[PDB]
Design a binder for these strands. Structure first.
Lengths: 139, 109, 190, 201, 175, 252
RNA sequence: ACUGAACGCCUCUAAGUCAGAAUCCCGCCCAGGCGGAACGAUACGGCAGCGCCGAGGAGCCUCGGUUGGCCCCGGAUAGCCGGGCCCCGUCCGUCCCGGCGUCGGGACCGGGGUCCGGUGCGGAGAGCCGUUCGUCUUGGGAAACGGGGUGCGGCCGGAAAGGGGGCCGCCCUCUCGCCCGUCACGUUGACGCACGUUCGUGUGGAACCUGGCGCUAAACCAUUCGUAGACGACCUGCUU
RNA sequence: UCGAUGUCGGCUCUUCCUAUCAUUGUGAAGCAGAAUUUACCAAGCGUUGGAUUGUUCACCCACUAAUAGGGAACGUGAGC
RNA sequence: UGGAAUGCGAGUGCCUAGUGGGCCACUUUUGGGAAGCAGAACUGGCGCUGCGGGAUGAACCGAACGCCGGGUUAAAGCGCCCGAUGCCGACGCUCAUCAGACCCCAGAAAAGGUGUUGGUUGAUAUAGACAGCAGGACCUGCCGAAUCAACUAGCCCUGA
RNA sequence: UGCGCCGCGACCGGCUCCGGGACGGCCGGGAAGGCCCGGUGGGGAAGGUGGCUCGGGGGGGGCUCACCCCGAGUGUUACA
């Protein structure tokens, strides 16, 4: 039933630590609560992180446990984890959530104008398809 | 054309368990539920707007039934977004659980 | 101590199809179908293989108490497998010293009437669980036969009549009267 | 937010929901709690049933009609747990208590409304999955609550009607997706503005 | 004593020079204490019960913190300790996995308090050494000696309660 | 210290309030449980206690000492003239209990039943139900009645009939009829309503409610005896003759 | 006692089941909340009161709060959400012979499956809807199967605790509104300043004038009764 | 508590406790049956009529399913 | 060279009221089974004293007081009553059909548990462990990797 | 010297609680860590990669051939 696994090479997303919003790779498992992680291509140096602050992703790198930074970096660059992450829907939601939080007052005004006009056109079409559906169902 | 104040609730006076100091009021501002979010509201003017029976003069208007006790947000309280405020006259106890406006007037942003 | 992984596997015969709706297990065989819910146990159930299918039970980060549920689930599923292929047949015998125990079967094996137990006039009527049929055996003089697919339903029905014929206010060591489960087996042997 | 806070009591824990409701109602908010029979209490049913029976034994032996009143409906059971969290002997506590409304089932005002949930009181969040718990509906029925079957049939009728309303909502939603594709040429500029600003990405 | 996250201190001391003994021997201990002030007090506690040397008749020649040599390497630690129970004193050997020697000792103080209600004043730590994976003895530590370690995170409790504090959607804990 | 010798308590706390009844007419507090498979029938009736006499009969219980022997048994005579159906009440089941949904009355209601609606019939103008009855005649009102029976059909779980006794036929000073709700049991709610509607304004004799040698329940108000001491009210032991300040009382 | 691990066997116990009592809880019975419901009748006749049409307004006093809305699946959590396809049952309306034939299709659900997407929920409550300076000259988009009139009717709307919307026709308002431009102004450009900006035609009370349709009663005392009773109270009768 | 808390016992009446005599449901025996003893859930219900004594206590006579033990200002005197 | 350090202005007379029932606590201590009993030593306290905390309380913990504004603490706390953890607090332990929950303090012991968690000591097991399938009557063959015993001490349970 | 009443602002000073930015000292003259395929190096193991052997599960082409994915050994850098 499970698909994501804490394992050596698993890429994880940090949620709330000092390194919130970074990607790390699991290098070793210290115990059931802590894992040795390394972020050589994401400006996170090797350290111990709790499993409570990391959200596992789909990407699994290939390196042995306790491998040094250069081998974690070679795997990260070979798999191109940075560009693959940016192409995911998880990252797109993150970037949309951050840019909506940065919306200015003038941008809020312009979104109001666009949303007002957009919903008028959609509402008109939804009504037309309603009438088509009810007429086709009951001629 | 629209509201120009933030919604706050007069939770109670600054107090211990068995001693109540009435010169300081404690406010809960809507949408502020952490100590680090209370910085914006420090020094903001706050108003207790109520209604009475007799008419009183209104600045820039005709006499009506609206009376105001003015105050300002002094500092944060707790680490859950509550603030404390000092009003020119100590607030009446009937206002506990009722609306207090935070007017955004003295602006730093 | 929380063990990382405890696992066990059950082999599924060729005459049985097992389907998993989460922790609900459906076992289908020549004698019928059985269903059982395991939502009270936090384990992961998997089906492995295209031919010679297997059921694997996994428990992660379990303590000693919840590691004991892995084999319990496996044993239950092995019971539903044998229930739909071989069935369950519990034979009972009537033991008496003076007063014969008269057993009459009504409603196609659903109601068991026991008369003259220790000579008294009260008629004991025991109702079998749904899907359990009671029969009077022709091989032995006084022996009952319970048949069904669910092992828990068949054995609960046997317990119902064994406790119905209980002796009161007398030394149970000496009187020894009653109907007792003699052997547990299968409807068909294979 | 504000206005009236309507809470679905199903799946919540009794005291943890009561503590949150008690503070909200002291802050001036009007609170409505529906489906109080779905409220859970930690610990096996027998232990919680014993707790209520000990409560039933408490009674003024000179005149029990004066004595403590043991309400058996789950809504009134919840009302009394919030009552013990409020200063109900003062005017402020009484006024706050009047702002609370508790209901068994979902009567006419409030099924055609969206109910809220308090995650800090949910059983799936606050209880370990291997710990036993009790249902307030069953516990109330075993101590004298008269209407659990009736509230069950009315719940079933409500869930059927809510199911038809949801299919109509789904058909509207899938029509709106088809409308979006149909007018993509004439709404592209407005969609572009929304995407740039974090909506619709 | 009490604890924060302990550090390791190398404390070297001796007796004051005397006409009988002009060059008294130097003694060294490894002390795990929250700060160097507590480390010196702990040094005098042990050396007085071992070598008949009191603080008033001696001096602390050196007291510095011992930094971890491989803080990015996962290790197994054996701790030899003795502690006082409510009835009797006992010798215990325990294992921990950690990145630093001090962190393993802090784990041991927490674990003694959790499992035996032992307070820090009732514990004496006499040996801490790094153990190879082949010489570990406790099953709790041995299960992480697996080059293909792999486990999911089954039932994640929502820790961000009270952030909305009132929501339409019930939380999902599968991930 | 403990009671020296044990004795059971005097009286029962199951009739505790021991006050004057708030009602003069007996009240059915629980009707027989409804069974939809049984035919449609009434469950109660109203009678009047005329007197007592004794009968002679021969009993038929085989193992008794009076088997096949003649016995004398006291009996009570309850005069039960037929009741007149004047209304229908519908009830819905709610999580707060049974709630009155809608009641419908007949077109013509006799004066003896209207007397129940007044405290001074002599001074009254007898205007009760004079506008309601016109609804049975008007075409718009007739449609509302049919809609009101249909709503009762699809929403009500309990159906009752409002019936009154005929005090013209009784030798009593009182002329005001007793009104009562009698629950209709058996069948479906639709069948109950159809049964009720067709015998609206009609007469129900007691033989269609009760039958011979059946065991029934009697509800009523006990004979009044006014203020009484503990000796008569609760049957406590009288205190000795030489007691000061009273014998007919509880000492402690 | 059952099934069954822990502990390859065993085990009533750990998860999960069964039978079980002068006990317990409810029922039956007694009372009936500063607790509700359905129904009936609602003021002399010439002086009047009262009810409905959200009645039509104009004004007054009083009690205060508040300062956009969300009209809803059921739920699971060692799993879920959304879409078409197969199987098992259901439903409407078009021809055929009110009722039949899958006679065929569209439109449908409920269940079990199968695929295809999504899942740190984006068909997202970290959300969505709406989002108002006012008029004027005029262009381009959008709409023109639209806006509004408690307009007027008509249909289907609903009982757990009457609040109910959508659809159809006929008129007028007709493309004015919504988005981007252009043009010309403002009873306030009131010359830096608070209680502004709403719900709202708010709750309660009394009154003024004007227009229709309606209504003409009971309760208590007194007098009787004795199915009642210390006194109150209660059960009764008084031109049929 | 001494500018006063009426005092032994009985009578009357209520409620409570269980450390259970009986009765409901059970487990054990040096439990064959009958009778009895040991223990568990358990205080719902019941636990009497008399001779002697001011007596509590005691003792005997006789029925009984049993004739268990206690508290409530050593319950209860503007109740006797 | 004012003959150690530190701190401090000292000396002295007359007249003199109330009091001369005490009580409590750490430590020490006598009689008593013991007592919220009786009797001592030292110091502090209550009495003479309010204030924050211990829900409440003479004596405990903190701190001693003219009327106020700001700031900060002590002891103690921060689910709600009730100010303050609405920290994405850390590691474990523990399920109780009488759970537990904070000095004085307001209720429990000996003895037990194959509940669960640690720890100590000894022993077996490739020639082959412990189980289980049986035989001879402690040995064997078949399954083929951990197991057995004693003790100890945390929470929970019986004792209650 | 004061406003009739209700208010607003500015800068200066005192106390106080906070927020940003930048500079330097010490340690084992910090411990680590990174890069140069570091070197043409030297050793040692296992939580042992590749290879080899044995057993298993899913592939293809047709039940041999075979493409993966496992488990168990053996083994010291090879395809980590």
């Amino acid at each position: 039933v499970f698909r994501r696994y804490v394992e050596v090479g698993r890429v994880a997303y940090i949620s709330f630590g000092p390194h919130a919003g970074k990607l790390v790779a699991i290098v070793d498992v210290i115990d059931q609560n802590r894992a040795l992680v390394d972020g050589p291509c994401t400006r996170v140096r090797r350290q111990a992180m709790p499993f409570k602050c990391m959200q596992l992703t789909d990407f699994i790198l290939k390196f042995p446990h306790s491998a040094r930074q250069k081998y974690v970096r070679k795997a990260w660059e070979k798999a191109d984890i940075n560009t693959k992450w940016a192409a995911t829907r998880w990252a797109k939601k993150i970037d949309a959530r951050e840019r909506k939080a940065k919306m200015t007052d003038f941008d809020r005004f312009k979104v109001m104008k666009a949303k007002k006009m957009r919903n008028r056109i959609i509402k008109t079409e939804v009504k037309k398809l309603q009438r088509a559906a009810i007429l086709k169902a009951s001629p | 054309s629209g509201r120009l104040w933030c919604k706050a609730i007069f939770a109670g006076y600054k107090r211990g368990l068995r001693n109540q100091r009435e010169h300081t009021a404690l406010l809960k501002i809507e949408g502020v539920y952490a100590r680090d979010e209370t910085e914006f509201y420090l020094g903001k003017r706050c108003a207790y707007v109520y209604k009475a029976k007799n008419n009183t003069v209104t600045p820039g208007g005709k006499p009506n039934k609206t009376r105001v006790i003015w105050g300002k947000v002094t500092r944060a309280h707790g680490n859950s977004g509550m603030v404390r405020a000092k009003f020119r006259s100590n607030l009446p106890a009937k206002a506990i659980g009722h609306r207090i406006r935070v007017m955004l007037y003295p602006s730093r942003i | 101590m929380k063990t990382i992984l405890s696992n066990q596997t059950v082999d599924i015969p060729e005459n049985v199809e097992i389907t998993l709706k989460g922790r609900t297990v459906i076992v289908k065989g020549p004698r019928g179908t059985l269903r059982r819910d395991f939502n009270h146990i936090n384990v992961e159930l998997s089906l492995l293989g295209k031919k010679k299918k297997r059921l694997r039970v996994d428990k992660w980060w379990g303590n000693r108490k919840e590691l004991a549920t892995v084999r319990t689930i496996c044993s239950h599923v092995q019971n539903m497998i044998k229930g739909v292929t071989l069935g369950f047949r519990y034979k009972m015998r009537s033991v008496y010293a003076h007063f014969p125990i008269n057993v009459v079967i009504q409603e196609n094996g659903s109601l068991v009437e026991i008369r003259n137990f220790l000579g008294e006039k009260y008629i004991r009527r025991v109702r079998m669980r749904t899907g359990v049929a009671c029969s009077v055996s022709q091989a032995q003089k006084d022996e009952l036969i319970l048949e069904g697919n669910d092992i828990e339903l068949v054995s609960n029905s046997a317990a119902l009549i064994q406790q119905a014929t209980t002796v009161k206010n007398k030394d149970i060591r000496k009187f020894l009267d009653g109907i007792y489960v003699s052997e547990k087996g299968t409807v068909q042997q294979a | 937010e504000g206005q009236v806070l309507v809470l679905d009591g199903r799946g919540h824990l009794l005291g943890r929901l009561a503590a949150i409701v008690a503070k909200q109602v002291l802050l001036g908010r009007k609170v409505v709690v529906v489906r109080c029979e779905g409220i859970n209490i930690s610990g096996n049913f027998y232990r919680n049933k014993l707790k209520y029976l000990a409560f039933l034994r408490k009674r003024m032996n000179t005149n029990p009609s004066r004595g403590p009143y043991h309400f058996r409906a789950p809504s009134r059971i919840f009302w009394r747990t919030v009552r013990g969290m409020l200063p109900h002997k003062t005017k402020r506590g009484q006024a706050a208590l009047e702002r609370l409304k508790v209901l068994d089932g979902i009567p006419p005002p409030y099924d055609k409304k969206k109910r809220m949930v308090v995650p800090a009181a949910l059983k799936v969040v606050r209880l370990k999955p291997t710990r036993k718990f009790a249902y307030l509906g069953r516990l109330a029925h075993e101590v004298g609550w008269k209407y659990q079957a009736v509230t069950a049939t009315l719940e079933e009728k409500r869930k059927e009607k809510a199911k038809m309303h949801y299919r109509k909502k789904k058909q509207i939603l899938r029509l709106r997706k088809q409308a979006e594709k149909n007018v993509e040429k004439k709404i592209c500029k407005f969609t572009e503005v929304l995407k740039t600003n974090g909506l619709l990405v | 004593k009490a604890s924060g996250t302990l550090r390791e201190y190398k404390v070297v001391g001796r007796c004051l020079p005397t006409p009988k003994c002009h060059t008294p021997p130097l003694y060294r201990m490894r002390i795990f204490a929250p700060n160097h002030v507590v480390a010196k007090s702990r040094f005098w506690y042990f050396v007085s019960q071992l070598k008949k040397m009191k603080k008033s008749s001696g001096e602390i020649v050196y007291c510095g913190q011992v930094f971890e040599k491989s803080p990015l390497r996962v290790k197994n630690f054996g701790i030899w300790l003795r502690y006082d129970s409510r009835s009797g004193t006992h010798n215990m050997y325990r294992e921990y996995r950690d990145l630093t020697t001090a962190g393993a000792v802090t784990q041991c103080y927490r674990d003694m308090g959790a499992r035996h209600r032992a307070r820090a004043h009732s514990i004496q730590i006499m040996k801490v050494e790094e153990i190879a994976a082949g010489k570990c003895r406790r099953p709790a530590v041995k299960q992480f000696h697996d080059s293909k370690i792999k486990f999911p995170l089954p039932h994640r409790v929502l820790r961000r309660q009270h952030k909305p504090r009132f929501t339409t959607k019930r939380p999902n804990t599968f991930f | 210290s403990h009671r020296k010798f044990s004795a059971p308590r005097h009286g029962s706390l199951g009739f505790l309030p021991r006050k004057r009844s708030s009602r003069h007419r007996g009240k059915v507090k629980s009707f027989p449980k409804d069974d939809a498979s049984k035919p449609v029938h009434l469950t109660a009736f109203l009678g009047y206690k005329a007197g007592m006499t004794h009968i002679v009969r021969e009993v038929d219980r085989p193992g008794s000492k009076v088997n096949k022997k003649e016995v004398v048994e006291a009996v009570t005579i309850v005069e039960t003239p037929p009741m007149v159906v004047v209304g229908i009440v519908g009830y819905v089941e709610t999580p707060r209990g049974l709630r009155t949904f809608k009641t419908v009355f007949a077109e013509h209601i006799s004066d003896e039943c209207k007397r129940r609606f007044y405290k001074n019939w002599h001074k009254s103008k007898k205007k009760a139900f004079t506008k309601y009855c016109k609804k049975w005649q008007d075409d718009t009102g007739k449609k509302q009645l049919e809609k009101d029976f249909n709503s009762m059909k699809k929403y009500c779980q309990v159906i009752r009939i409002i019936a009154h006794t005929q005090m013209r036929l009784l030798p009593l000073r009182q002329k005001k009829a007793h009104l009562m709700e009698i629950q209709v049991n058996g069948g479906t709610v639709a069948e109950k309503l159809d049964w009720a509607r067709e015998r609206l304004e009609q007469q129900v004799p007691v033989n269609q409610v009760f039958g011979q040698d059946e065991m029934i329940d009697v509800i009523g108000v006990t004979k009044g005896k006014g203020y009484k001491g503990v000796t008569s009210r609760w049957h406590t032991k009288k205190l000795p003759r030489k007691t000061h300040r009273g014998l007919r009382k509880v000492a402690c």
